[PDB]
Structures are given as structure tokens and as C-alpha cells.
Coordinates of C-alpha atoms and ligand atoms in Angstrom, one line a residue:
Chain A
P1 CA -30.4 37.6 33.2
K2 CA -29.3 39.3 29.9
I3 CA -26.2 38.2 28.0
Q4 CA -26.9 35.7 25.3
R5 CA -24.5 32.9 24.3
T6 CA -23.8 31.8 20.8
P7 CA -24.0 28.1 19.9
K8 CA -20.9 26.0 19.6
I9 CA -21.4 23.6 16.7
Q10 CA -19.6 20.2 16.3
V11 CA -20.1 17.8 13.4
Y12 CA -18.8 14.2 13.5
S13 CA -19.6 10.7 12.3
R14 CA -20.5 7.8 14.5
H15 CA -18.0 5.5 12.7
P16 CA -14.9 6.2 10.6
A17 CA -16.0 7.4 7.2
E18 CA -15.8 4.7 4.5
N19 CA -17.2 5.7 1.1
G20 CA -20.3 3.6 0.3
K21 CA -20.8 2.3 3.8
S22 CA -23.7 3.5 5.9
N23 CA -23.0 5.6 8.9
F24 CA -24.5 8.2 11.2
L25 CA -23.9 12.0 11.0
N26 CA -24.0 13.8 14.3
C27 CA -24.4 17.6 15.0
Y28 CA -23.8 18.5 18.7
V29 CA -24.9 22.1 19.4
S30 CA -24.1 23.4 22.8
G31 CA -23.2 26.4 24.9
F32 CA -26.1 28.5 23.7
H33 CA -28.6 30.7 25.5
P34 CA -31.6 31.3 25.2
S35 CA -32.9 27.8 24.2
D36 CA -34.8 28.8 21.1
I37 CA -32.8 27.4 18.2
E38 CA -33.1 26.1 14.7
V39 CA -30.9 23.2 13.4
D40 CA -30.8 21.4 10.1
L41 CA -28.5 18.8 8.7
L42 CA -27.6 19.4 5.0
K43 CA -26.6 17.1 2.2
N44 CA -25.0 19.1 -0.7
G45 CA -26.5 22.2 0.8
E46 CA -30.1 20.8 0.8
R47 CA -32.0 20.1 4.0
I48 CA -32.2 16.4 5.1
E49 CA -35.8 15.6 6.1
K50 CA -35.3 12.4 8.2
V51 CA -33.3 14.0 11.1
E52 CA -33.7 13.1 14.7
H53 CA -32.8 15.2 17.7
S54 CA -32.6 14.9 21.5
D55 CA -35.0 16.6 24.0
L56 CA -33.7 19.9 25.3
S57 CA -31.1 19.7 28.1
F58 CA -28.5 22.0 29.6
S59 CA -25.1 22.0 31.4
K60 CA -24.1 22.9 34.9
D61 CA -23.6 26.5 33.8
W62 CA -27.2 26.5 32.4
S63 CA -26.1 26.6 28.7
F64 CA -28.4 24.5 26.5
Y65 CA -27.3 21.6 24.3
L66 CA -28.9 19.4 21.7
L67 CA -27.8 16.5 19.5
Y68 CA -29.1 16.2 16.0
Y69 CA -28.4 13.1 13.9
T70 CA -29.3 11.3 10.7
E71 CA -28.3 8.2 8.8
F72 CA -26.0 8.9 5.9
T73 CA -23.8 7.1 3.4
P74 CA -20.6 9.1 2.8
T75 CA -19.3 9.3 -0.8
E76 CA -16.2 10.8 -2.3
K77 CA -17.7 14.1 -3.4
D78 CA -20.9 14.6 -1.3
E79 CA -20.9 17.4 1.2
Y80 CA -22.6 17.3 4.6
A81 CA -23.1 20.3 7.0
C82 CA -24.9 21.4 10.1
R83 CA -26.8 24.7 9.8
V84 CA -27.8 26.6 12.9
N85 CA -29.8 29.7 13.5
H86 CA -30.1 31.4 16.9
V87 CA -30.8 34.9 18.2
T88 CA -27.1 35.4 18.6
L89 CA -26.5 34.9 14.9
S90 CA -27.2 37.4 12.1
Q91 CA -27.6 34.6 9.5
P92 CA -27.5 30.8 9.7
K93 CA -24.1 29.4 10.6
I94 CA -23.2 26.5 8.4
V95 CA -20.4 24.1 9.7
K96 CA -19.3 21.5 7.2
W97 CA -18.5 17.9 8.1
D98 CA -14.9 16.9 7.7
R99 CA -13.4 13.4 8.1
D100 CA -9.8 14.5 8.8
Chain B
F3 CA -21.4 -0.7 40.4
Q4 CA -21.0 1.3 37.2
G5 CA -23.1 3.7 35.3
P6 CA -25.2 6.7 36.4
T7 CA -25.6 7.4 40.2
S8 CA -28.1 10.3 40.1
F9 CA -31.6 11.2 38.9
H10 CA -32.9 14.7 38.1
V11 CA -35.7 16.4 36.4
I12 CA -35.1 19.7 34.5
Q13 CA -37.5 22.5 33.6
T14 CA -37.0 25.2 30.9
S15 CA -39.8 27.9 31.0
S16 CA -39.7 30.4 28.2
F17 CA -41.7 33.6 28.7
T18 CA -42.3 35.4 25.4
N19 CA -44.6 38.1 26.7
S20 CA -47.2 38.7 29.5
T21 CA -49.6 36.2 28.0
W22 CA -47.5 33.5 26.4
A23 CA -45.2 31.0 28.1
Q24 CA -44.1 27.5 27.3
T25 CA -42.4 24.9 29.5
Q26 CA -40.2 21.9 28.5
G27 CA -39.3 19.2 31.0
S28 CA -37.5 15.8 31.2
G29 CA -36.0 13.3 33.5
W30 CA -32.4 12.1 33.5
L31 CA -30.0 9.5 35.0
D32 CA -26.8 11.5 34.8
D33 CA -26.7 12.3 31.0
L34 CA -29.2 9.6 30.0
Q35 CA -32.8 10.7 29.4
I36 CA -35.4 8.3 30.9
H37 CA -38.5 10.6 31.0
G38 CA -39.9 13.1 28.6
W39 CA -42.7 15.6 29.3
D40 CA -45.6 15.6 26.8
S41 CA -47.0 19.1 26.7
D42 CA -49.8 17.8 24.4
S43 CA -51.3 15.7 27.3
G44 CA -49.6 17.1 30.4
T45 CA -48.2 13.6 31.1
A46 CA -44.8 12.0 31.2
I47 CA -43.3 9.9 28.4
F48 CA -41.5 6.8 29.7
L49 CA -38.5 6.2 27.4
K50 CA -37.5 2.8 28.9
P51 CA -39.6 -0.1 30.1
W52 CA -38.1 0.4 33.5
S53 CA -38.5 4.2 33.7
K54 CA -41.1 3.9 36.5
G55 CA -38.5 2.2 38.8
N56 CA -40.3 0.4 41.6
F57 CA -43.1 3.0 41.8
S58 CA -46.8 1.9 41.4
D59 CA -48.8 3.3 38.5
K60 CA -50.9 5.2 41.1
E61 CA -47.9 7.0 42.6
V62 CA -46.5 7.7 39.1
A63 CA -49.8 9.1 38.1
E64 CA -50.0 11.2 41.3
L65 CA -46.5 12.6 40.5
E66 CA -47.5 13.4 36.9
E67 CA -50.4 15.5 38.3
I68 CA -48.2 17.4 40.8
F69 CA -45.9 18.3 37.8
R70 CA -48.8 19.2 35.6
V71 CA -50.3 21.5 38.3
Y72 CA -46.9 22.9 39.1
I73 CA -46.1 23.7 35.4
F74 CA -49.4 25.5 34.9
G75 CA -49.2 27.4 38.2
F76 CA -45.6 28.4 37.8
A77 CA -46.3 30.2 34.5
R78 CA -49.4 31.7 36.0
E79 CA -47.7 33.1 39.0
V80 CA -44.6 34.2 37.2
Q81 CA -46.8 36.2 34.8
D82 CA -48.8 37.8 37.7
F83 CA -45.6 38.9 39.6
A84 CA -43.4 39.9 36.6
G85 CA -44.4 43.5 37.0
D86 CA -43.5 43.6 40.7
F87 CA -40.2 41.8 40.0
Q88 CA -39.4 44.4 37.2
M89 CA -39.1 41.7 34.6
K90 CA -38.5 42.5 30.9
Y91 CA -39.7 40.1 28.2
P92 CA -38.6 37.7 26.8
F93 CA -36.9 35.7 29.6
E94 CA -36.2 32.1 30.4
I95 CA -36.2 30.3 33.7
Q96 CA -34.4 27.0 34.3
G97 CA -34.6 24.5 37.1
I98 CA -33.1 21.2 38.0
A99 CA -34.0 19.0 41.0
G100 CA -33.0 15.5 42.1
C101 CA -30.7 13.4 44.2
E102 CA -27.5 11.4 43.9
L103 CA -26.0 8.3 45.5
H104 CA -22.5 8.9 46.8
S105 CA -19.7 6.6 47.8
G106 CA -20.5 5.2 51.2
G107 CA -24.2 5.1 50.5
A108 CA -25.5 8.6 51.4
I109 CA -28.1 10.1 49.0
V110 CA -27.9 13.8 48.6
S111 CA -30.7 15.9 47.1
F112 CA -30.5 19.3 45.3
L113 CA -32.6 21.9 43.7
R114 CA -31.3 24.8 41.7
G115 CA -33.0 27.6 39.7
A116 CA -31.8 30.0 37.1
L117 CA -32.9 33.3 35.4
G118 CA -31.3 34.5 32.2
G119 CA -28.8 31.7 32.3
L120 CA -27.5 32.7 35.7
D121 CA -27.9 31.0 39.1
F122 CA -30.9 32.4 40.9
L123 CA -31.7 30.2 43.9
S124 CA -31.1 26.8 45.5
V125 CA -32.7 24.7 48.2
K126 CA -30.4 24.0 51.1
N127 CA -31.8 22.2 54.1
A128 CA -35.4 22.4 52.8
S129 CA -34.9 26.2 52.7
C130 CA -34.9 28.7 49.8
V131 CA -31.5 30.3 49.5
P132 CA -31.1 33.3 47.1
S133 CA -28.1 33.2 44.9
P134 CA -25.9 36.4 44.7
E135 CA -26.2 36.6 40.9
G136 CA -30.0 36.7 41.4
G137 CA -29.6 39.9 43.4
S138 CA -32.4 41.6 45.3
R139 CA -34.9 40.0 42.9
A140 CA -34.0 36.5 44.2
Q141 CA -34.2 37.8 47.8
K142 CA -37.7 39.0 47.0
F143 CA -38.6 35.6 45.4
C144 CA -37.5 33.5 48.3
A145 CA -39.4 35.6 50.8
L146 CA -42.5 35.3 48.5
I147 CA -42.3 31.6 47.9
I148 CA -42.1 30.4 51.5
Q149 CA -45.5 31.9 52.2
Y150 CA -47.5 29.9 49.7
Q151 CA -49.1 27.0 51.6
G152 CA -47.9 23.6 50.7
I153 CA -45.2 24.5 48.3
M154 CA -42.2 24.1 50.6
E155 CA -43.6 21.1 52.3
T156 CA -44.2 19.4 48.9
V157 CA -40.7 20.3 47.7
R158 CA -39.3 18.9 51.0
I159 CA -41.1 15.6 50.6
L160 CA -40.2 15.3 47.0
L161 CA -36.5 16.1 47.5
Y162 CA -35.7 14.2 50.6
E163 CA -38.3 11.4 50.8
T164 CA -39.6 10.6 47.3
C165 CA -36.4 11.2 45.2
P166 CA -34.0 8.8 47.2
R167 CA -36.4 5.8 47.0
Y168 CA -37.2 6.6 43.4
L169 CA -33.5 6.8 42.6
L170 CA -32.6 3.4 44.2
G171 CA -35.6 1.7 42.6
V172 CA -34.8 2.9 39.1
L173 CA -31.1 2.2 39.3
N174 CA -32.1 -1.4 40.2
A175 CA -34.9 -1.7 37.6
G176 CA -32.6 -0.4 34.8
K177 CA -29.4 -2.3 35.7
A178 CA -29.5 -4.4 32.5
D179 CA -29.1 -1.2 30.4
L180 CA -27.5 1.1 33.0
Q181 CA -24.7 -1.4 33.8
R182 CA -24.0 -2.9 30.4
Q183 CA -20.6 -2.8 28.8
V184 CA -20.3 -1.6 25.2
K185 CA -16.9 -1.7 23.5
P186 CA -15.5 1.3 21.7
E187 CA -13.9 1.3 18.3
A188 CA -10.9 3.4 17.7
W189 CA -9.2 4.9 14.6
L190 CA -6.4 7.4 13.7
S191 CA -6.3 10.4 11.5
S192 CA -3.8 13.3 11.0
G193 CA -4.9 16.9 11.2
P194 CA -3.2 20.1 10.2
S195 CA -1.1 22.0 12.7
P196 CA 0.2 25.6 12.6
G197 CA 3.9 26.4 12.2
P198 CA 6.5 24.7 10.1
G199 CA 6.9 21.0 10.1
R200 CA 4.1 20.4 12.7
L201 CA 1.4 17.7 12.5
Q202 CA -1.6 17.0 14.7
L203 CA -2.4 13.3 15.2
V204 CA -5.9 12.4 16.3
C205 CA -7.0 9.2 18.0
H206 CA -10.8 8.8 17.7
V207 CA -12.6 6.6 20.2
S208 CA -16.4 6.1 19.6
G209 CA -19.3 3.9 20.8
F210 CA -18.3 3.1 24.3
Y211 CA -20.5 2.9 27.4
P212 CA -20.2 3.5 30.4
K213 CA -18.7 7.0 30.1
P214 CA -15.3 6.6 31.9
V215 CA -12.5 5.9 29.4
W216 CA -8.8 6.2 29.2
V217 CA -7.0 7.3 25.9
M218 CA -3.3 8.2 25.6
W219 CA -0.8 8.8 22.9
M220 CA 2.3 6.6 23.7
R221 CA 5.8 6.0 22.5
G222 CA 6.3 2.4 23.6
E223 CA 5.5 2.4 27.3
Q224 CA 6.0 6.2 27.6
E225 CA 2.7 8.0 27.9
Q226 CA 3.0 11.3 26.0
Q227 CA 2.0 14.1 28.4
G228 CA 1.2 16.3 25.4
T229 CA -2.0 14.2 24.9
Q230 CA -4.9 16.6 24.8
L231 CA -8.4 15.2 25.4
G232 CA -11.4 16.7 23.6
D233 CA -14.8 17.1 25.1
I234 CA -16.8 13.8 25.4
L235 CA -19.5 14.1 22.8
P236 CA -22.7 12.1 22.6
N237 CA -23.8 9.5 20.1
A238 CA -27.4 8.4 19.7
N239 CA -28.4 5.4 21.8
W240 CA -26.3 6.0 24.9
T241 CA -22.7 5.8 23.9
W242 CA -19.9 8.4 23.6
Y243 CA -17.2 9.7 21.3
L244 CA -13.9 11.2 22.3
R245 CA -10.8 12.5 20.4
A246 CA -7.4 12.6 21.9
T247 CA -4.9 14.7 20.0
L248 CA -1.1 15.1 19.9
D249 CA 0.9 17.9 18.3
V250 CA 4.2 16.6 17.0
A251 CA 7.1 17.8 14.8
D252 CA 6.9 16.3 11.3
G253 CA 9.9 14.0 11.6
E254 CA 8.9 12.8 15.1
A255 CA 5.5 11.1 14.3
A256 CA 6.9 7.6 13.6
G257 CA 6.9 5.5 16.7
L258 CA 3.7 6.9 18.1
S259 CA 0.7 4.7 19.1
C260 CA -2.7 5.4 20.7
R261 CA -3.7 3.2 23.7
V262 CA -7.4 2.9 24.8
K263 CA -8.5 1.4 28.1
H264 CA -12.1 0.8 28.9
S265 CA -14.1 -1.2 31.4
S266 CA -15.7 -3.2 28.6
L267 CA -12.4 -4.5 27.1
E268 CA -11.7 -6.9 30.0
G269 CA -8.1 -5.8 30.2
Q270 CA -7.5 -6.1 26.4
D271 CA -6.5 -2.5 25.6
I272 CA -6.9 -1.2 22.0
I273 CA -3.6 -0.2 20.6
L274 CA -3.3 1.6 17.2
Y275 CA 0.0 2.4 15.6
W276 CA 0.7 5.5 13.6
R277 CA 2.6 4.7 10.4
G278 CA 4.2 7.5 8.4
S279 CA 4.4 8.5 4.7
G280 CA 0.7 7.9 4.2
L281 CA 0.8 4.2 5.1
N282 CA -2.3 4.6 7.2
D283 CA -5.7 3.3 6.4
Ligands
LIG1 C1 -38.5 1.3 46.1 O1 -37.2 0.9 46.5 C2 -36.7 1.6 47.7 C3 -35.3 1.2 47.9 O2 -35.1 0.0 48.5 C4 -35.4 -1.1 47.6 O3 -36.2 -2.0 48.4 C5 -35.4 -2.8 49.2 C6 -36.3 -3.5 50.1 C7 -34.6 -3.7 48.3 O4 -35.4 -4.2 47.3 C8 -33.5 -2.9 47.7 O5 -32.8 -3.7 46.8 C9 -34.1 -1.7 47.0 O6 -33.1 -0.8 46.8 C10 -37.6 1.4 48.9 O7 -37.2 2.2 50.0 C11 -36.6 1.5 51.1 O8 -37.6 0.8 51.8 C12 -37.1 0.1 52.9 C13 -38.3 -0.7 53.5 O9 -38.5 -1.9 52.6 C14 -36.5 1.0 54.0 O10 -35.9 0.3 55.0 C15 -36.4 0.7 56.3 O11 -35.5 1.7 56.8 C16 -35.8 2.1 58.1 C17 -34.7 3.1 58.5 O12 -34.8 4.1 57.6 C18 -34.2 5.3 58.2 O13 -32.8 5.2 58.6 C19 -31.9 4.9 57.4 C20 -30.5 4.8 58.0 O14 -30.4 3.5 58.8 C21 -32.0 6.0 56.4 O15 -31.2 5.7 55.3 C22 -33.5 6.2 56.0 O16 -33.6 7.2 55.0 C23 -34.4 6.5 57.2 O17 -33.9 7.7 57.8 C24 -35.9 1.0 59.1 O18 -36.5 1.5 60.3 C25 -36.9 -0.1 58.6 O19 -36.8 -1.2 59.6 C26 -38.2 -1.7 59.7 O20 -38.4 -2.6 58.6 C27 -37.6 -3.7 58.5 C28 -38.1 -4.6 57.3 O21 -37.8 -3.9 56.1 C29 -37.5 -4.5 59.8 O22 -36.4 -5.5 59.6 C30 -37.2 -3.6 61.0 O23 -37.2 -4.4 62.2 C31 -38.2 -2.5 61.1 O24 -39.4 -3.1 61.3 C32 -36.4 -0.5 57.2 O25 -35.1 -1.1 57.4 C33 -35.4 1.9 53.3 O26 -35.0 2.8 54.2 C34 -36.0 2.6 52.1 N1 -35.0 3.4 51.4 C35 -35.1 4.7 51.1 C36 -34.0 5.3 50.4 O27 -36.2 5.3 51.3 C37 -39.1 1.7 48.6 O28 -39.9 1.4 49.7 C38 -40.9 2.3 50.0 O29 -40.5 3.5 50.6 C39 -39.9 3.3 51.9 C40 -39.5 4.7 52.4 C41 -40.8 2.6 52.8 O30 -42.0 3.4 53.1 C42 -41.3 1.3 52.2 O31 -42.2 0.7 53.1 C43 -41.9 1.6 50.9 O32 -42.4 0.4 50.2 C44 -39.5 1.0 47.3 N2 -40.8 1.4 46.9 C45 -41.3 2.7 46.7 C46 -42.7 2.8 46.2 O33 -40.5 3.7 46.8
PIE2 C1 -41.9 9.0 37.3 C2 -41.1 9.1 38.6 C3 -40.8 10.5 39.1 C4 -40.0 10.5 40.3 C5 -39.8 11.9 41.0 C6 -38.8 11.9 42.1 C7 -38.6 13.3 42.8 C8 -38.1 14.4 41.9 C9 -37.4 15.4 42.8 C10 -37.7 16.7 43.0 C11 -38.8 17.5 42.5 C12 -38.8 18.9 43.0 C13 -39.6 20.0 42.3 C14 -41.1 19.9 42.5 C15 -41.9 21.1 42.0 C16 -43.4 21.1 42.3 C17 -43.7 21.3 43.8 C18 -45.1 22.0 44.0 O1 -45.1 23.1 44.5 O2 -46.1 21.2 43.6 C19 -47.4 21.9 43.3 C20 -47.9 22.8 44.4 O3 -48.9 23.7 43.8 C21 -48.5 24.6 42.9 O4 -47.4 24.7 42.6 C22 -49.6 25.5 42.4 C23 -49.1 26.8 41.9 C24 -48.5 27.7 42.9 C25 -47.3 28.4 42.5 C26 -46.1 27.6 42.1 C27 -44.8 28.4 42.0 C28 -43.6 27.5 42.4 C29 -42.3 28.3 42.5 C30 -41.2 27.6 43.3 C31 -40.5 26.6 42.5 C32 -39.2 26.1 43.2 C33 -39.4 25.3 44.4 C34 -39.2 26.0 45.7 C35 -37.9 26.7 45.8 C36 -37.6 27.2 47.2 C37 -48.4 20.9 42.8 O5 -48.8 20.0 43.9 P1 -50.3 19.6 44.1 O6 -51.1 20.1 42.9 O7 -50.4 18.1 44.3 O8 -50.7 20.4 45.4 C38 -50.2 20.1 46.7 C39 -50.7 18.8 47.2 O9 -52.2 18.8 47.1 C40 -50.3 18.6 48.7 O10 -50.8 17.3 49.1 C41 -50.9 19.7 49.6 O11 -50.5 19.4 50.9 C42 -50.4 21.0 49.1 O12 -51.0 22.1 49.9 C43 -50.6 21.3 47.6 O13 -49.9 22.5 47.2
6UL3 C1 -44.0 33.8 43.4 C2 -43.6 33.9 41.9 C3 -42.7 35.1 41.6 C4 -42.4 35.3 40.1 C5 -41.8 36.6 39.6 C6 -40.3 36.5 39.6 C7 -39.7 35.8 38.4 C8 -38.2 35.6 38.5 C9 -37.7 34.5 39.4 C10 -37.3 33.2 38.8 C11 -37.4 32.0 39.8 C12 -36.7 30.7 39.3 C13 -36.8 29.5 40.2 C14 -37.0 28.2 39.5 C15 -37.1 27.0 40.4 C16 -37.7 25.7 39.7 C17 -37.0 24.4 40.1 C18 -37.8 23.2 39.9 C19 -37.3 22.1 39.0 C20 -38.2 20.9 38.8 C21 -39.4 21.1 37.8 C22 -39.8 19.8 37.0 C23 -40.9 19.9 36.0 C24 -40.7 18.9 34.9 O1 -41.3 17.6 35.2 C25 -40.9 16.5 34.6 O2 -40.4 16.5 33.5 C26 -41.2 15.3 35.3 C27 -41.1 14.1 34.4 C28 -40.8 12.8 35.2 C29 -41.8 12.6 36.3 C30 -43.1 11.9 36.0
LIG4 C1 -47.5 37.4 22.8 O1 -46.8 36.6 21.8 C2 -47.6 35.8 21.0 C3 -46.8 35.3 19.9 O2 -46.0 34.1 20.2 C4 -44.7 34.2 19.6 O3 -44.5 35.4 18.9 C5 -43.2 35.6 18.2 C6 -42.4 36.7 18.9 C7 -42.5 34.3 18.0 O4 -41.8 33.9 19.2 C8 -43.5 33.2 17.6 O5 -42.8 32.0 17.2 C9 -44.5 32.9 18.6 O6 -45.8 32.5 18.1 C10 -48.9 36.5 20.4 O7 -49.8 35.5 20.0 C11 -49.8 35.7 18.5 O8 -50.7 36.7 18.1 C12 -50.7 36.8 16.7 C13 -51.6 38.0 16.4 O9 -51.9 38.8 17.6 C14 -51.1 35.6 16.0 O10 -50.9 35.7 14.6 C15 -50.3 34.4 16.5 O11 -50.9 33.2 16.0 C16 -50.3 34.3 18.0 N1 -49.4 33.3 18.5 C17 -49.7 32.0 18.6 C18 -48.7 31.0 19.1 O12 -50.9 31.6 18.3 C19 -49.6 37.4 21.4 O13 -50.5 38.2 20.8 C20 -48.6 38.2 22.2 N2 -49.2 39.1 23.2 C21 -49.2 40.4 23.2 C22 -49.9 41.1 24.3 O14 -48.6 41.0 22.3
CL5 CL1 -23.4 21.2 2.5
CL6 CL1 -23.0 35.9 12.0
CL7 CL1 -22.4 6.6 32.4
CL8 CL1 -52.3 21.1 31.4
CL9 CL1 -48.3 20.6 30.4
CL10 CL1 -38.0 3.7 41.8
NA11 NA1 -49.1 32.3 29.9
NA12 NA1 1.2 24.1 9.3

């Protein structure tokens, strides 16, 4: 009962990105152990306050997973990211959203 | 019938030190959450109007109390025995228990427990079975647990008598949501690929329910065996997202299309055509 597993972090939009059209940004954080984890969604490096998330669950191999999501409106230059901290990580891991 | 065929409850109990532990719990139809556990009240949160199935409020309340008592006593007893079981803090215990409806109508129940992310025990035939990864610690636990009055008989009743009727009642009560058909939307994008003159084409498929789906890169009628399916990722509100990718040499992308088949489409497959030279949306 001893090896810790680092989060996999996957960022994606609910709909194809169209600049100026409302959408949903998803961050799926999975494969980690233990369950204690901190997750933010970022807009231009600043934390988004109205972010929802799922209740804790886990996979057959007992690794935990969570879904974080927020409404967002993509634009040409704005940047969105998912920022995760976990015991396996020495500092927060930021994973930027990318359309293509 | 389509949609989920199983119900389970999960527990995650996090032990920080000898005097602090916290448990999280929930109830699920396959991947779809239908119950939460409210630690503020020691009662369940019913996420759908039909989450109680065909159970009476009395039996639902009685079940909430069994879980509340169990959650408190589990932490209490794990703390008391942690010294004998040579436990080092912090550690985390997981459990899952439930039942599933199989083809041909049989309902099969299960209970599995984990320590440190590794299998620790299971219940087979209303009996505690230690798992090999759990080592002698799990052999000690199973021999301990079966001596506490009531525990094994309550597990036996819940697994093999309560769960199957609960499962059948809730799959029926929830059929309007559980068996609905939601159509996916699909779109194409082109990613980078290593090595000279190589492209990766991506076919995104998002917003479908139920979960089974078929996505393939095609040249005319020829399904491209190089199609690689990503993991099925969740959306909010009970739909899924899936990417199917194809690695192709630069001058061989033209002529490719992505074909999506889904139960909701009533035989009208989605077909997207890759166009070259940037003539894509
Ligand atoms: C919530 O729903 C459950 C699922 O069934 C639902 O209810 C039925 C009526 C329909 O609405 C379905 O659409 C729906 O899915 C209920 O559980 C089921 O209850 C029925 C009784 O209504 C019960 O049928 C009985 O079965 C026994 C045989 O059972 C044994 O053998 C079978 C294999 O053959 C095995 O699968 C079982 O597990 C057992 O090992 C049979 O002897 C009974 O016959 C008697 O009654 C009938 C009249 O119904 C009569 O014609 C006969 O002549 C004889 O008197 C009867 O057929 C189902 O087995 C049971 N299913 C499961 C999986 O448990 C549930 O009902 C409640 O629990 C039941 C266990 C029983 O105590 C009911 O009285 C309870 O109300 C319902 N409610 C709750 C609170 O769970
Ligand atoms: C909303 C719809 C929901 C649908 C739900 C559908 C079904 C879901 C499917 C499966 C659920 C399975 C998991 C259930 C877990 C709780 C069972 C239980 O023990 O109930 C509890 C028994 O008591 C305790 O646990 C007290 C603390 C003792 C130590 C506990 C350590 C447990 C370690 C082993 C765990 C692994 C398990 C064992 C592994 C081998 C609570 O039951 P009770 O308070 O009604 O009492 C009981 C009660 O009073 C009895 O009447 C009496 O006879 C008895 O003596 C007493 O103890
Ligand atoms: C005798 C104790 C010894 C302790 C010391 C050793 C410690 C290491 C051993 C680790 C043992 C691990 C075994 C774990 C088994 C637990 C499996 C049970 C899973 C079910 C629990 C569900 C609780 C959550 O309840 C809900 O969410 C219900 C909500 C819907 C119903 C209303
Ligand atoms: C056992 O631990 C708790 C602390 O709980 C956690 O501690 C950290 C490791 C981290 O996981 C935090 O997020 C948790 O709070 C101790 O309780 C704390 O005690 C200190 C002072 O003693 C107090 O400031 C905190 O408020 C307490 N925590 C809470 C949640 O109120 C407890 O003392 C520890 N027990 C022993 C014997 O060391
Ligand atoms: Cl950012
Ligand atoms: Cl790092
Ligand atoms: Cl499904
Ligand atoms: Cl309580
Ligand atoms: Cl509680
Ligand atoms: Cl039910
Ligand atoms: Na405690
Ligand atoms: Na390249």
C-alpha cells in the first residue's frame, strides 16, 4: 500500500471551439493515488471561480478520477489551462487547453 | 435494453493519523452517479428524482442508517487495530460493492476492498477472501472480520438480497433517463505528427449517450485499420467524448473520411470528409 500515482491531466472542450460562441471547458484528471488533489481551471493564468466538479470516483485498478468543468467563451488570444497539485508533484502542473 | 446494467456504492476512507479520518461515498449506475453521501448530515443525496428506485422511504432511511453506522464504526475499528496491523499513516482504504444484471437475466453481486491502491480482499460466496497483494495483513483482517456479530450476515443480505431488487427497481424507475438516445456531434482537426511528411488527423465525437459508439477513418468503403481510438472521456450531464486518430503521410490525406455510427442516429451515420490544403472548417 505504498506507491503513489501521479495524475494524468486531459483538457478538452465540449463543442468545437468557435471564437465568440459559448462552450464548456473540461479537465479530466485521472490515474492518481492517493485521492487528495487540488484542481483549478485557469483563464489567462488566473483562477476561474465558477468551476464545478464531480464527486470522487475511481477505476477498476483503484486509481481516482475527477471531472472539472466551467462555462467559457473561447476567443482568438485568451488562454485556458488546468492546474493540478498532488503529493506526487513538486509544484503545480499546468496543462494548457489546445483546440488542434 | 440499453444503458447501465449495474449498481454499486463506493467508499474512500482517508486516514491522516491515529485520530483523524474522513470517508467519501457515492452510488453509481455504471459510470453515472445517482447517489451522493453527505458527510454534513450522515445521509444520502439523491441526484435524480428516481434514485430511490422502487424502495419505500422507510427502507431507504433504514439503509442510510446502516451506512452511517458502518462509516463511523469502520473508522473507529480501523484506528483501534492499526497498531496490530502494523499500519503507517497516512493511508487510504477503498471499497466497492454492488450487483450487475447479465445477459440471460442472472444478477451477480460483488464486493472488493483495497489498501494503498492495491486489492486487499473480496467477498466470494458470502465469504471474506484475502487478496494476495494484501499479504498476511489481509489474512489477519479476514479472520478478524468474520468474528464480529452481524457484520457478515448484514453484508450477505445487502449483497445477495437487497442489491438485486434495488437494481431492478432503479433501472426501471430511471428508464426515461437511462435509456434515452442523445446524438453525437462530430468534427475534424489535424494534429502534428513526428517524422518527415507525416500528419495526424483527428475525428472528434462528442455529446453521445449511451456509451457504445463506433468511429472509423475510411477511404470510401475501406475502413482504415490504422484508426486509433482514444479513451472515452466524460462530459458533464451524462454524455461522452471520443477522439479517433489516424497517422498518414502528407500526400495521402486526401480521400479520407470519418464515419460515426451510434444507436441514436437511427441508421443515418455521420460522415465527415477531410479536405486538403486548408480547405477545412
Ligand atoms: C422492487 O422491484 C423488484 C423487482 O421486480 C419488480 O417488481 C416486479 C413485480 C415487476 O414490477 C418488475 O417489472 C420489477 O422488476 C421486486 O423484487 C421481485 O419481487 C417479486 C415479487 O413481486 C419476486 O417474484 C417472486 O419470485 C419468487 C421466486 O424467487 C426465487 O426464485 C427466482 C428464480 O425463479 C430467483 O430469481 C429469486 O431470486 C428467488 O431465488 C416466486 O416464488 C414468487 O412467486 C410467488 O408470488 C407470485 C406473485 O408474484 C405468485 O404468482 C406465485 O404463485 C407465488 O405465490 C414470485 O414470483 C422477484 O423474485 C423479486 N426479484 C428480485 C430480484 O428480488 C421488489 O419486490 C420486493 O422484494 C421481493 C424480494 C419480494 O419480497 C417482494 O414481495 C417485495 O415487494 C420490489 N420492491 C422492493 C422494496 O424491493
Ligand atoms: C438508496 C438505495 C440503496 C440501495 C443499496 C443496495 C445494496 C448495496 C450493496 C452492498 C452493500 C455492502 C456493504 C455494506 C457495509 C455495511 C455492513 C455492516 O456491517 O453494517 C453495519 C454493522 O455494524 C457495524 O459495522 C458497526 C461497526 C463494526 C465494525 C465495522 C467494520 C467493517 C469492516 C468490513 C467491511 C467489509 C465487509 C465485509 C468483508 C468481508 C451497520 O448495520 P446496523 O447499524 O444496522 O447494525 C446491524 C443491524 O442492526 C442488524 O439488524 C443486526 O442483525 C446486526 O447485528 C447489526 O450489526
Ligand atoms: C477489524 C478492523 C481491522 C482494521 C485494521 C487493518 C486495516 C487494513 C485493512 C483494510 C481493509 C479494507 C476492506 C474494505 C472493505 C469495504 C467495502 C465496502 C464498500 C461499501 C461501503 C459504502 C459506504 C458508502 O455509502 C453510500 O454512499 C451509500 C449511498 C447510497 C445508499 C443510501
Ligand atoms: C492529526 O491530524 C490533524 C490534522 O488534519 C490534517 O493535517 C494536515 C496533515 C493536513 O492534511 C490538513 O489538511 C488536515 O487538517 C490534527 O488536527 C489539527 O490540529 C492542529 C493543531 O494540533 C489544528 O491547527 C488543526 O485545526 C487540526 N485539524 C483540524 C482538521 O481541525 C491532529 O492534531 C493530528 N493528531 C495528532 C495526534 O497529531
Ligand atoms: Cl492559462
Ligand atoms: Cl514536478
Ligand atoms: Cl451507458
Ligand atoms: Cl454521523
Ligand atoms: Cl457520515
Ligand atoms: Cl429499486
Ligand atoms: Na478518527
Ligand atoms: Na513532424
